[PDB]
Amino acid sequence: IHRSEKMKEIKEAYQQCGQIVGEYAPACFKALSYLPLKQRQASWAVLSFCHTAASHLWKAFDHAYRTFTLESEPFREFIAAQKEDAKPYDDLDELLMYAYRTGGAAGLMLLPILTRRKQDQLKQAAVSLGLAIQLVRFLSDLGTDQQKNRIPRQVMQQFGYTEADLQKGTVNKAFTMTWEYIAFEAEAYLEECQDALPLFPQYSQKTVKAALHLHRAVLEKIRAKQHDVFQYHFALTETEVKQILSD
Numbered sequence: 001i002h003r004s005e006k007m008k009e010i011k012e013a014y015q016q017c018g019q020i021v022g023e024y025a026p027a028c029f030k031a032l033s034y035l036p037l038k039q040r041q042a043s044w045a046v047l048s049f050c051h052t053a054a055s056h057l058w059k060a061f062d063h064a065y066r067t068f069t070l071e072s073e074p075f076r077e078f079i080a081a082q083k084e085d086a087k088p089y090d091d092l093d094e095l096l097m098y099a100y101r102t103g104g105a106a107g108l109m110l111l112p113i114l115t116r117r118k119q120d121q122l123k124q125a126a127v128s129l130g131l132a133i134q135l136v137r138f139l140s141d142l143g144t145d146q147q148k149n150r151i152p153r154q155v156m157q158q159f160g161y162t163e164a165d166l167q168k169g170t171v172n173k174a175f176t177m178t179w180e181y182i183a184f185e186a187e188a189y190l191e192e193c194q195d196a197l198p199l200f201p202q203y204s205q206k207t208v209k210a211a212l213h214l215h216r217a218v219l220e221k222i223r224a225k226q227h228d229v230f231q232y233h234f235a236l237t238e239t240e241v242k243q244i245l246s247d
Helices: 005-024 026-032 037-053 058-068 072-082 092-114 119-139 153-159 163-168 173-195 202-224 238-245
Strands: none
Touching: 005 026, 005 037, 005 058, 026 037, 026 202, 026 238, 037 058, 037 072, 037 092, 058 092, 072 092, 092 119, 092 173, 092 202, 119 173, 119 202, 153 163, 153 173, 163 173, 173 202, 202 238
């Protein structure tokens, strides 16, 4: 087929979007692999955009935008949320609002790609999934001050976890209670998407199911490794993903 140079450039840009996501989000990339090619590549573009903004390729993004009639709002929301705050979060609501504006927004970005019909019925599930995934990522690595800053001071106070403990990266009972209190919320969002799993079209169910299983597994691994998130960034290995996804 004589493809236009423009389309050739779009295909190149998409592949690069896939290289990116595959590198910075192996688990999600794996979950997305179950989508048909058109949807899969579109998802790469959306998440590549997220990664890029969190730290040309627009050709593939515009293509995805026009192909799936994506909405501009969530993309704007995500961008605005990258302007930060060097101050620690106070309320759990503050952390949740943040996960909502980033992960939740990403979930909304992807909605039109995950489903063509029952979008109204699956919107809540998509946002909850993205929100939960962001919470899981947050709970998987507390190595820097920026990450430590997202731990809600009111939650820390509830269990007696001190600023001094946190700065030292001390993993004591007070810390695990703080961590589990936040993990409880993440799991509630996950279960919410789990309940709506049968509503997604067959072409995207394996992708949603994979995402759900993978992130639940991440939380379990962290627990298995004694919540040692101040020292290591937790992620599933290729071997682990394979087992989780064996079905």
